[PDB]
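Cross-posted from the bioinformatics board.
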Amino acid sequence: SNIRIVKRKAKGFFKCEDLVTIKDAVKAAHRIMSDASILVRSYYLRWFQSSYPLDSDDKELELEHFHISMACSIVQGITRPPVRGVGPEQSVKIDVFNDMLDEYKRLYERAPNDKENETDLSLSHVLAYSIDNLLTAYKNNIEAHFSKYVKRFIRCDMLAKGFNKSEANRVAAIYTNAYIYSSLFPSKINKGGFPRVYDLKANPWVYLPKMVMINQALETDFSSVEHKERRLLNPLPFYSSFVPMHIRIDTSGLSQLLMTKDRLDDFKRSYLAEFGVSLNIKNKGDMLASFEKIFGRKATSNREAGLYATEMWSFLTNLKTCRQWKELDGVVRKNDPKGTQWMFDNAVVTDGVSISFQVIDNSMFGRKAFSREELKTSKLLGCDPGKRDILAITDGIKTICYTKGQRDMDTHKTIRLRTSLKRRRGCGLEEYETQVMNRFQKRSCHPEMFRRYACSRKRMEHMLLECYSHPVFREFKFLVYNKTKSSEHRFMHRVLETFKRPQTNLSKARCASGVMRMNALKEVQRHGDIIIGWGNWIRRRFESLFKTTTVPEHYTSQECPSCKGRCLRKATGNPIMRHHLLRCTNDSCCSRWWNRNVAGAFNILTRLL
DNA sequence: CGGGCATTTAAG
DNA sequence: GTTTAATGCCTTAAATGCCCG
RNA sequence: AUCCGGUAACGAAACUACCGGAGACGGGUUAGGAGGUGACGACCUCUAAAACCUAGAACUUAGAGUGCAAAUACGAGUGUAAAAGCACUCUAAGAGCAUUAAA
Ligand SMILES: [Zn+2]
């Protein structure tokens, strides 16, 4: 959609007297969701043993908003049913609420207490987006990773059947593709006869029981197999990181937290004086009513209502007076053909240290209702992507690569590791975290194993949260975001200054054929006049200045520019089997020695030309 | 002897 | 510890629990 | 102790060796540049900073500007006398993020 973000620091945006509440809210929200997520996961596994294989006479357990909302209430110590009024349809809520409450009494090894989980902020609206995000994560995990569970089970089933792991991939690969497009799948859902892969999107809750069983089978059925091959998956996501997470603040959410009667009454005077209209507000109860009730008549258009929302932010924040206002005041970017004008969307995502502003197109501002000839002159380049070496660009005579170490130095990986360990060791958490919680695997789907991790953490939860709340940890998150741009931008600049001029030598490379030299003599003065051949597999930022095209990667690691076939193979017959040394298999070759970076790039460039 | 304020839930 | 794939981007009326000059 | 370029054994690999260059998150405190005598050096002075402490700022690349840091000649043997780096403003090109899972 037409929604974009501007990420900056939060200093100066919120007033000092209001910044205290925001920081407390971030900690309070994290604690509720982090503990609530564990409670929800524990309850599901209790019901998991109710039925497998799935019975045909009952429906599966499907989570909804009220499920998580009740979990949050239990964590905060609210033991009374949340049902408003009484009704036969609402009776189901009461039964579920008591069922989860009893689980809380057993998940933790001591009687619940109400005053140990005190909170004093109206986080009802803020937690709403977090609950939706958590439930969305459940759907995404189930609907987009089932095939990966199949691979793990099958590649362990082969080992259990006596096959050495050399043959496991031989059969597993075909089985996975064939079955997706043996007993790990449910009954066909779609009556239209579409392939089995389609059924995964029909309903995630049907496939969820299978994934849990796969985890239990990996832990019990395949216990004899090597633990390295049985690295556990996580069917049920939950918030684990102790670092406070970002929260979403809207016009309604901001109003609830930072508004009081003595402050709300001033809003009426300021609005009346500047606009000559008195708002229909008496107390905090009528603050967030509809526009028609507030002004007494229907708005002419959505934009009129939106302007009222912006004034709400203006009175409570320095939106129109802070440093960041420069980038939100109707900014138009120079090279947009449509000339889209952007303005603030009355929404903020922040974590106390960093703030992200939401900016939308001016054509939709308001309250939202629920619902090839250049190849002749262009200079060509070729590169083969990878992971040990991220990129390797060549012009046929010279090579440049974007090594992993380059980004590590740019992002200060070593310094960040040292600082984090030093701070943790000061509080004494190193001994407990490295020894106690290391053994207890949180990803385990066994009710016993998960309970032990949950209860062990509860004894050190308070210490852990305070230690990780230090701003140093949150500052590093901004640093990696900022420095990642610098590393890629510098490399892009280096590419231009390397191939911007003709090569000074045309004989160093023996394998350089006649075709290669033709593309090296052209001069190019602009980023957009360079075309880089790329593999099928950072590229998304490269395309912002450089033009790119796709070349097949098949057999590019063995083919040779000037040979009848794939003469290249990894070196063998030496004391040390090194990483990627390449050696030719026959004398009829231009170069008897090669490496993956040069070999792969040259073949791609040859195909490009 | 009365009236008033602030959370929170619900469907949309 | 880091990268890729996936989803998302929200408003307003009524119940009730509490409070004190 | 990592990164960049070259040398060898018909483009060597996280070590097979050698030669030339870059860099250490922010705030406190350290050694290096430069100056009364723009001799030399002694003390002082402007700037600045690795190991240690610390609830702690900041959209990114190319270039262009302004603006910094000041208190051996003569009279008869003998007395007087711009560097490292930083800040601001410009021109050109870019500019959506939160969470989970997976490898
Ligand atoms: Zn060959």
